From Swiss-Prot, chain A:
Localization: Virion
Name of the protein in its database record: Major capsid protein
Domain of life according to the entry: Viruses
Residue ranges of coiled coil: none
Known function: Capsid protein self-assembles, with the help of the scaffolding protein gp11, to form an icosahedral capsid with a T=7 symmetry, about 61 nm in diameter. The capsid encapsulates the genomic DNA.
Residues of the full protein shown: 218 to 271 of 324
Organism: Bacillus phage SPP1 (Bacteriophage SPP1)
Assembly mode: Interacts with the scaffolding protein gp11. Interacts with the decoration protein gp12.
From Swiss-Prot, chain B:
Family: Belongs to the lambda phage major capsid protein family.
Full-protein residues shown: 56 to 109 of 324
Name the record gives this protein: Major capsid protein
Location of this chain's protein in the cell: Virion
Species for this entry: Bacillus phage SPP1
Function text: Capsid protein self-assembles, with the help of the scaffolding protein gp11, to form an icosahedral capsid with a T=7 symmetry, about 61 nm in diameter. The capsid encapsulates the genomic DNA.
Complex and partners: Interacts with the scaffolding protein gp11. Interacts with the decoration protein gp12.
Gene responsible for this protein: 13
Length: 54, 54
C-alpha cells in the first residue's frame, strides 16, 4: 500500500490509475562514492553556516 | 507552542561551471483555550424537618 503513484486526469473529472506490477525481486543498482561526502564552511566577515552532501 | 516544519525541495544537477544555492526553514503557530464552569443549588429547613429526611 502506498499513497504515491502517478495519477493523470482527463476532462470531465475522471481519474486514471496505474499501479505497477513488478513482483520481480528484482532489478538492480549500486551506490558508489564521491570524495568529501560532508563538509562544513562558514563565512567570517558575514555570519552564516551551511551543510553539503553530494 | 511553536514548531519547525521539515525542509522541502529538489536537488540540483551537480556540475562544474556552476555552484549551489542554500535554502531556508520556517515556523508556525499553535493555540488553545482555558475555560471554567460552576453552579449551585439550595435546599430548605422546615420542609426537611416536616418531610422525614433532609
Amino acid at each position: 500500500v502506498d499513497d504515491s503513484m502517478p495519477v493523470e486526469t482527463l476532462e470531465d473529472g475522471t481519474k486514471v490509475f496505474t499501479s505497477y506490477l513488478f513482483g520481480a525481486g528484482a532489478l538492480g543498482y549500486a551506490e558508489g562514492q564521491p570524495e568529501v561526502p560532508t563538509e562544513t564552511a562558514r563565512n567570517a566577515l558575514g555570519s552564516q553556516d551551511i551543510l553539503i552532501n553530494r | 507552542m511553536p514548531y519547525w516544519n521539515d525542509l522541502d525541495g529538489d536537488s540540483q544537477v551537480l556540475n562544474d561551471t556552476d555552484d549551489l544555492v542554500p535554502q531556508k526553514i520556517n515556523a508556525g503557530q499553535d493555540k488553545a483555550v482555558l475555560i471554567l464552569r460552576g453552579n449551585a443549588w439550595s435546599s430548605h429547613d422546615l420542609a426537611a424537618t416536616l418531610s422525614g429526611s433532609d
